[PDB]
Symmetry: D2
Subunit: 114 residues, 4 copies
């Protein structure tokens, strides 16, 4: 799997379970094609989110539904979503991990690329 | 002015000057209308980005062109853009400051709401 | 004043008021001399923390009592304290601002150096 | 192993290899007892850093030598070290992971506690 996510909760000190997200690929005319969706497990991950055939070179957007996560926790969130947009160059089985650290009014995101 | 930004550079310890951004409001059908553009000054700020008349409650997006910023700093960036998407509740002259801390492969964003 | 702080609360989207801190300079033998204390105001700042006369070049530590802050907010914290330790090069009226973004199990710290 | 670390590099988008650190336990009179040291591998980790017998309930400090890491990379760092101080309650094989995201003038740290 060339695309992994890891989400943590900065209020409780746990991975962020049950976060919904969607992966889209940018189209020529500027639109977006949905290619996968999922919900993180209790470790804040989605295993085998997409396949290598689904992940050609191009621009991708991963949209994380952080608002619902905080609503469930009882907190009042600021953001509607966390968005991560990047150009993928997957040749050579290059792998992408998107890490995300959530607070109700803040998030930190980083990427680890092999 | 109800919407401010403050952008900092985590590599060199200075505000991020000359960062372009676009502000959009979400429409009822789920699309986006651009309502303003600007470029940060050398303090990492944009004064008078929008007016209170342009800022009813709703969903807003600020798109920061961080890729062009890192290219101009001379460091290869990961993100194609940094998008901050948030719910506005201006009732009562509430002001919003979007703070953004930039590194080539990471950013932290938070908000200060008066 | 050559040393400023700005503390924000990532849970509620406001400055962190009433955060106690202690400033120390490192001695030649590797110990620490306390040179100032303060408490943040409701803007998350401490004015006139030290003077230029108290700020030669060297190694400084700012110890932020974040555990007492989170206890008073009513959220269980992870860290016993947040310590920021840095090299000062004041030659030329260089000013230092320590920015600190707090969550119960995380913090982000950066600096803006004039 | 009850204590793990994970260090990432926000400039290059890789784990932070070859970072030296030391683990100390707080003493009654306020001092510190060194209990382990190590250097991260290429995945930004130190496997089996300490044993459960070495990790009684108490306050611990993990000091990461970030200055040397940035000097090696050619960057000019702000901080001397990154310090993480916390009270450990290891009963029930409770585990602690200290995560750390480094930039030359900034770091984010968080903890995951099982
Ligand atoms: O699970 C892991 O080992 C991990 F992916 F490396 C990570 F620990 F989650 C992490 F990416 F390092 C991290 F914790 F998320 C972080 F340090 F990057 C962070 F916390 F700062 C951020 F905010 F990015 F999530
Ligand atoms: O300039 C200011 O007064 C400010 F907006 F408060 C700020 F200092 F930039 C800040 F927001 F606090 C901050 F520095 F950006 C931060 F601390 F929040 C940060 F650095 F951690 C983050 F990464 F969020 F920008």
């Amino acid at each position: 799997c060339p695309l992994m996510v890891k989400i943590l909760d900065a209020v409780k000190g746990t991975p962020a379970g049950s976060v919904a997200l969607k992966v889209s690929q940018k189209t020529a005319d500027g639109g977006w094609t949905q290619i996968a969706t999922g919900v993180t497990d209790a470790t804040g991950e989605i295993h085998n989110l997409i396949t290598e055939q689904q992940f050609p070179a191009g621009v991708y957007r991963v949209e994380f539904d952080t608002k619902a996560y905080w609503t469930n926790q009882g907190s009042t969130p600021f953001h509607e979503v966390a968005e991560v947009v990047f150009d993928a160059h997957p040749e050579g089985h290059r792998h992408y991990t998107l890490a995300l650290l959530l607070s109700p009014f803040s998030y930190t995101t980083t990427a680890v690329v092999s």
